[PDB]
Each structure stands twice: as structure tokens, then as C-alpha cells.
Amino acid sequence: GIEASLLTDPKDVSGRTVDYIIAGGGLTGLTTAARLTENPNISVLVIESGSYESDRGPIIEDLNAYGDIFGSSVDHAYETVELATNNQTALIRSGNGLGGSTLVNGGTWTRPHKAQVDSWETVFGNEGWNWDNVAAYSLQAERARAPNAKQIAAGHYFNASCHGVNGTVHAGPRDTGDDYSPIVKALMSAVEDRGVPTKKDFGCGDPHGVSMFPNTLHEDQVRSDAAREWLLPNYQRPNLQVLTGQYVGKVLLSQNGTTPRAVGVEFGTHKGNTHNVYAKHEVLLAAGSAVSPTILEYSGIGMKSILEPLGIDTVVDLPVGLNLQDQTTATVRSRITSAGAGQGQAAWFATFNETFGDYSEKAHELLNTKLEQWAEEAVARGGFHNTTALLIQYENYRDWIVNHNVAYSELFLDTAGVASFDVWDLLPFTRGYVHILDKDPYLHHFAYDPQYFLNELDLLGQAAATQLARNISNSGAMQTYFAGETIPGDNLAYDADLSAWTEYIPYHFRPNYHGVGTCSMMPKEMGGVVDNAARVYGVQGLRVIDGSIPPTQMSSHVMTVFYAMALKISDAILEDYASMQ
Numbered sequence: 169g170i171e172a173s174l175l176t177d178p179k180d181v182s183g184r185t186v187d188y189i190i191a192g193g194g195l196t197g198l199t200t201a202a203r204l205t206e207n208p209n210i211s212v213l214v215i216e217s218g219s220y221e222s223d224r225g226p227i228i229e230d231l232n233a234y235g236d237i238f239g240s241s242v243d244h245a246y247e248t249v250e251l252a253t254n255n256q257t258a259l260i261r262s263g264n265g266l267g268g269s270t271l272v273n274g275g276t277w278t279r280p281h282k283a284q285v286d287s288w289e290t291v292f293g294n295e296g297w298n299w300d301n302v303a304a305y306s307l308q309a310e311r312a313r314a315p316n317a318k319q320i321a322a323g324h325y326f327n328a329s330c331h332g333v334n335g336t337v338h339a340g341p342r343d344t345g346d347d348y349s350p351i352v353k354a355l356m357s358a359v360e361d362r363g364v365p366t367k368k369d370f371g372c373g374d375p376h377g378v379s380m381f382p383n384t385l386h387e388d389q390v391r392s393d394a395a396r397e398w399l400l401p402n403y404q405r406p407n408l409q410v411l412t413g414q415y416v417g418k419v420l421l422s423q424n425g426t427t428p429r430a431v432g433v434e435f436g437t438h439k440g441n442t443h444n445v446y447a448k449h450e451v452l453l454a455a456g457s458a459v460s461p462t463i464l465e466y467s468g469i470g471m472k473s474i475l476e477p478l479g480i481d482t483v484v485d486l487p488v489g490l491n492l493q494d495q496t497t498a499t500v501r502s503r504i505t506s507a508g509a510g511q512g513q514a515a516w517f518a519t520f521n522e523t524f525g526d527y528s529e530k531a532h533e534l535l536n537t538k539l540e541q542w543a544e545e546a547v548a549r550g551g552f553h554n555t556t557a558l559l560i561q562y563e564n565y566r567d568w569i570v571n572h573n574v575a576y577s578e579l580f581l582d583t584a585g586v587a588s589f590d591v592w593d594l595l596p597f598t599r600g601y602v603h604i605l606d607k608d609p610y611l612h613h614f615a616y617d618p619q620y621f622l623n624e625l626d627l628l629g630q631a632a633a634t635q636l637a638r639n640i641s642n643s644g645a646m647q648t649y650f651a652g653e654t655i656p657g658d659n660l661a662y663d664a665d666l667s668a669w670t671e672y673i674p675y676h677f678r679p680n681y682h683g684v685g686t687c688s689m690m691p692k693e694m695g696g697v698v699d700n701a702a703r704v705y706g707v708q709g710l711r712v713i714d715g716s717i718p719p720t721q722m723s724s725h726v727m728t729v730f731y732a733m734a735l736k737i738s739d740a741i742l743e744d745y746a747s748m749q
């Protein structure tokens with residue numbers, strides 16, 4: 169079936185011209201591929217490092233098997249630099265295959281706070297990037313299924329208004345066929361008790377309180393990976409071509425005009441085993457935020473100071489790779505009594521004051537008075553290059569927290585036999601970078617530094633959120649199911665205070681694999697790399713369409729907006745295509 173249509177032979181595409189070349193077959197790349205080829209005169213070639221894996225078996229198809237694939241070849245596992253917070257290397261899990269990280273994520277489907285997306289337009293000057301517009305496309309990509317009696321009974325709430333049911337991404341309640349755990353509702357009572365909302369539909373634009381949510385899976389529980397949703401139904405499209413197992417090394421730029429123009433791409437597996445394919449219209453980079461920026465740097469698009477020592481000629485000087493925003497994750501795990509047995513996941517989207525509790529006052533002084541200092545510090549560390557532009561982003565976050573009271577922490581609960589909390593501070597103030605460390609793209613020698621916890625609010629923010637998760641595990645209704653803390657367990661005193669948690673955390677956290685921002689959609693003056701249409705500044709025919717582009721973090725799981733985002737850019741591209749005649 170699909171597997172026979174994928175090209176695995178580099179020579180099947182070398183020297184050919186297609187209208188669009190999409191570097192990366194992941195969530196954004198396949199969504200775009202399928203959108204463009206809807207127009208039969210538009211020929212697309214997707215070049216993906218991995219191959220087809222959606223039908224491989226449960227390791228891919230069962231969301232309940234989440235994490236088993238880490239380390240296999242469907243895991244790019246990029247390692248960070250030796251992190252300064254703990255002097256360790258972290259591994260960035262990243263799907264390698266058709267569907268990219270949709271092949272390995274947990275499938276959570278939720279949406280951000282509308283003030284957040286709105287800020288893309290008002291603060292970042294991205295005309296058209298507002299909630300109304302973005303939520304519109306999001307509903308357009310969605311094929312939500314309403315929860316049944318048992319699912320509602322368990323704690324599910326679905327506002328129909330907030331969901332599309334004619335889309336492409338099959339989404340619905342995960343259901344292992346087993347009974348749901350009483351613990352979901354027990355968590356809802358514990359938060360209700362402290363005045364936190366519950367059962368608010370997270371796809372509505374106000375992700376707050378504790379709610380259950382849909383997952384990208386068909387009713388049959390099979391993963392709605394991007395390849396299964398947009399490629400599988402469409403692989404027979406003669407204008408859709410996908411080369412597997414090859415690496416896009418860099419964009420070919422013709423420089424005999426007023427502006428360099430992206431002409432095609434170079435791909436291969438090794439220095440000396442490369443091939444060139446060309447594009448009539450444009451090169452769309454969709455290799456993920458850890459790699460689209462390096463593709464640009466290998467190409468002469470990036471800062472002269474990085475490019476120059478590597479022997480690369482800088483064609484366009486832009487702050488490629490700066491502004492990386494990823495989250496830190498910490499676990500709190502507690503054993504439960506047999507009474508709490510069953511399946512179920514829920515998340516508390518806690519606001520600033522709910523995260524910090526008694527420290528809200530303190531936490532607030534910081535937000536209010538450290539903005540500039542923090543901005544100079546992150547700039548000094550290479551996370552960004554312009555303090556003022558950085559400041560504006562901080563002021564934007566102060567605004568969302570202070571005036572829109574968006575969710576600052578995410579406490580994700582996993583039951584299925586334990587009460588396991590994965591907690592992450594959703595709005596990091598730290599800025600990291602990603603820069604190539606060599607001129608050969610196939611050496612894959614790059615420095616990825618998310619600078620986790622180099623900003624004090626982030627550390628405290630993560631310490632408070634995790635401490636919160638220990639607190640609710642054993643509060644109110646939760647208490648009846650609690651049967652002893654497993655992790656940290658003996659590694660951290662139960663009665664640990666915020667500082668103790670602060671000290672513990674840099675050594676017991678993992679990246680959240682939600683890195684965005686390395687090719688930021690913001691005006692060039694503000695440190696942006698791409699315009700409101702995802703076009704790289706100063707180059708013709710080059711777009712960056714993936715997680716590299718959101719200029720901010722979001723209080724949600726990103727798939728909903730990333731599919732919305734790929735759809736909106738595809739429209740943009742369609743318009744430019746009909747113009748390019």
C-alpha cells in the first residue's frame with residue numbers, strides 16, 4: 169500500500185524539478201503536502217529522514233505504549249549541549265519518520281488561551297495570526313468525536329462549539345476498554361475545593377482547571393499520526409511524492425538577482441553522497457525546530473558570527489536559531505490503593521497564583537521588577553540578540569499572567585495503576601539557541617542549548633508546580649487513594665519546602681520536547697526570521713512552516729495550533745502560487 173509508493177532511491181528524484189520541496193514529513197510538512205497537492209497542478213516532493221511507521225504495530229499505534237519507541241530509530245534523540253543547570257546532556261525525543269513527532273507523542277489534544285494567539289497579531293504584528301483566525305483553521309483540521317456516557321461519567325466534558333467534526337485529524341477520548349479510574353474525579357474535587365474550575369473544555373480558548381481531554385486517535389484507539397491522517401488517504405495523488413530515508417542538508421540559493429532565491433535542495437546521508445532536487449516555486453522547511461534552523465545555517469542564512477568561523481558564506485544575516493523556548497518536566501509519582509484502579513489522564517492547567525500559592529506575592533515582585541535584568545542575561549547567554557525585543561516578549565508574558573490570567577503550569581495526571589504527575593512550567597522566560605557546529609550537514613554536529621532553568625522564575629516556577637503536584641496527590645478526595653509517594657519518594661523529603669525543591673529539580677527533570685521559536689515569526693526589527701506568511705526575510709521562495717516559527721510558548725499541547733498553523737500557511741502559499749504566474 170503506501171509503502172510501495174514511497175521512493176527510497178535518491179536517483180529517483182535527483183535532477184527533477186517540482187513546484188514545492190518540503191524538507192520534513194512531520195506534522196506540519198505532511199499537512200502542507202496534502203493541502204498543496206489538493207490542487208492537481210501542484211507537484212510536491214516531501215523528503216523525510218525516516219520512513220513509514222504508522223502500521224508498524226502497537227509501539228506506534230497504541231498511545232498507551234507511549235515512550236517504548238524512545239531510543240529506536242523512530243527517535244532522532246538529539247542530545248543537548250552539556251546543560252549548565254546540571255552539567256548533563258539531555259536527549260530531545262523527536263519522531264523520525266512520516267508523521268515526525270506525531271509518531272511518538274502522547275496524543276493530547278487541547279488549545280491555548282486566546283489572549284496568547286491574539287498576541288501574535290497585536291504584540292508581534294503578525295497580521296491575521298489571531299485567535300479567531302487560528303481557532304478557525306484549528307476547527308477545520310479537527311475531526312472530534314464526542315465522549316460517550318461512560319467517558320462523561322468518568323469526567324469528560326465536550327463543548328461541541330469548540331470542535332470541528334468535519335476535519336481530518338481524528339480526535340476523541342482515549343479508552344482502553346477498561347474502567348476509568350475514580351482518581352480523575354477525586355482530583356477534580358481536590359481542586360474544586362480550593363476554587364479551581366474543572367471540566368472546562370480545553371479546546372475552547374480558556375484552558376483552566378482540571379479537565380480530561382481528547383487524544384488524536386481513531387475510535388478504534390489507533391494513533392492519528394500525521395502520516396495516517398494526511399498522507400495515507402492521499403498517497404496515491406500523482407503530484408505528491410515522498411522520498412524516505414534521506415536527509416535534507418541545505419537549500420540551494422541562486423545569487424545573481426536582487427535577492428537570493430531558494431532554487432531547490434541538497435539531500436543525502438553522508439558528506440559525498442548528496443543529491444540536488446529543484447523547486448519551481450518554493451522550498452518549505454518543515455524539519456522541526458531543532459533542525460529547520462540548522463538547514464538555514466548550513467545554507468548561509470544565519471548570523472555571520474556563527475557562519476563565518478565555519479567557513480560558510482553568509483548570504484542573509486538573520487538571528488536564526490535564537491529564541492528557543494522549551495519546557496522542563498518533572499514527575500511526582502504516588503502509589504494508589506486498589507480502589508483507584510483504572511485508566512484515565514487529566515491535566516490541571518494552573519494559573520500563576522495557583523502554581524505559586526502562598527508565594528504569589530513574591531513571584532509577582534519578580535515578574536514586575538526583573539524583566540530587563542532577565543532580558544540582558546538571556547541575551548548575554550546567546551538565547552537572543554536584542555534586549556528590547558526580548559523585553560517586549562517578557563512584557564507580553566507579564567500581560568498574559570497579570571491581565572489575562574493564563575495558565576502557567578501544566579500538571580498532567582496519568583493513572584492506569586498509579587497517580588503519576590508530569591508537571592511543566594508552560595511559559596518559560598529562558599531563551600536558548602541552536603547553532604550548527606560544522607559546515608557538513610550530514611555530520612549532524614550541532615549545539616542545541618535550551619538553557620533550562622537559567623532564568624530563576626523558571627526554576628521557581630517549575631519547583632512550585634511540581635511541589636503542587638505532590639500536594640494535590642494527597643489532598644482532599646485524593647487522600648483516599650494515596651498509598652505512598654514513589655518518586656521523588658526517598659529522594660526528596662515529603663515535607664520539602666520550595667528551596668529544597670529548587671535544588672532537587674535541575675537533577676530530576678527532562679526536556680518537554682516542545683521547542684518552538686528558532687525561526688521566529690515576528691517582524692525583522694523584533695528579531696524575527698520569517699514574516700506573517702512564514703517567508704524567511706530577504707530570500708525569495710523560502711519558507712519555514714514548522715515549530716521553529718511560533719514566537720511564543722502556548723498554554724497547551726501544540727498539535728491543534730500546529731495543524732491550524734500549517735493550514736493557514738498552505739492557504740498563503742496557494743495565493744502566492746496563483747500570483748506567481
Ligand SMILES: *[C@@H]1O[C@H](CO)[C@@H](O[C@@H]2O[C@H](CO)[C@@H](O[C@@H]3O[C@H](CO)[C@@H](O)[C@H](O[C@H]4O[C@H](CO)[C@@H](O)[C@H](O)[C@@H]4O[C@H]4O[C@H](CO)[C@@H](O)[C@H](O)[C@@H]4O)[C@@H]3O)[C@H](O)[C@H]2NC(C)=O)[C@H](O)[C@H]1NC(C)=O
Pocket residue numbers: 252253254255
Ligand atoms: C558544572 O561544571 C563546572 C566545571 O566544569 C562547575 O564549575 C566549576 O565549579 C567549581 C566549584 O564547584 C569552581 O572551582 C572553584 O574555583 C574558585 C575560583 O573562583 C576557587 O576559589 C575554588 O577553590 C576553593 O574550593 C575548592 C573546592 O572545594 C578548593 O579545592 C580550593 O582550595 C578552594 O577552597 C577555598 O574556598 C572554599 C570555598 O570558597 C573553602 O571551602 C575552602 O576552605 C577554601 O577557603 C574552586 O576551585 C570552578 O571555577 C567552576 N568553573 C570552572 C570553569 O571550572 C559548575 O559549578 C558545575 N555545575 C554544577 C551544577 O554542578
Ligand SMILES: Cc1cc2nc3c(=O)[nH]c(=O)nc-3n(C[C@H](O)[C@H](O)[C@H](O)COP(=O)(O)OP(=O)(O)OC[C@H]3O[C@@H](n4cnc5c(N)ncnc54)[C@H](O)[C@@H]3O)c2cc1C
Pocket residue numbers: 191192193194195196197215216217218244261262263264265266267268269270272273274275276277414415416417454455456457459680681682714715716725726727728730
Ligand atoms: C515525546 C514527545 C511528546 C510530545 N507530546 C505532545 C502531546 O502529547 N501533544 C501535543 O500536542 N504535541 C506533543 N508533542 C509535540 C508535537 O508532536 C510537535 O510539536 C509536532 O510534531 C512538531 O511538528 P513539526 O512539523 O515541527 O515537526 P516534526 O513533527 O518533528 O517533524 C519534523 C520532521 O522532519 C524529519 N526530519 C528531521 N530532520 C530532517 C532532515 N534533515 N531532513 C528531512 N526530514 C528531516 C523528522 O524526522 C520529522 O518527521 C510532543 C513531542 C514529542 C517528541
Ligand SMILES: *[C@@H]1O[C@H](CO)[C@@H](O)[C@H](O)[C@H]1NC(C)=O
Pocket residue numbers: 327328329330372
Ligand atoms: C461553548 O463555547 C463557547 C466559547 O466560545 C461558549 O460561547 C458556549 O456558550 C460554550 N458553552 C459552554 C456551556 O461552555
Ligand SMILES: *[C@@H]1O[C@H](CO)[C@@H](O)[C@H](O)[C@H]1NC(C)=O
Pocket residue numbers: 333334
Ligand atoms: C460536514 O459536512 C457534511 C456534508 O458535506 C455537512 O452535512 C455538515 O453540515 C458539515 N458540518 C459542519 C458543521 O460544517
Ligand SMILES: *[C@@H]1O[C@H](CO)[C@@H](O)[C@H](O)[C@H]1NC(C)=O
Pocket residue numbers: 521528529532569570573
Ligand atoms: C494574583 O495574586 C496577586 C497578588 O499576589 C494579585 O495582585 C492578583 O490580583 C491575583 N489574582 C489573579 C487572578 O491574578
Ligand SMILES: *[C@@H]1O[C@H](CO)[C@@H](O)[C@H](O)[C@H]1NC(C)=O
Pocket residue numbers: 554555556557560693694695
Ligand atoms: C531591537 O528591538 C527593538 C524592539 O523591537 C527595535 O525597535 C530595534 O530596531 C531593535 N534593534 C536592532 C538593532 O535591531
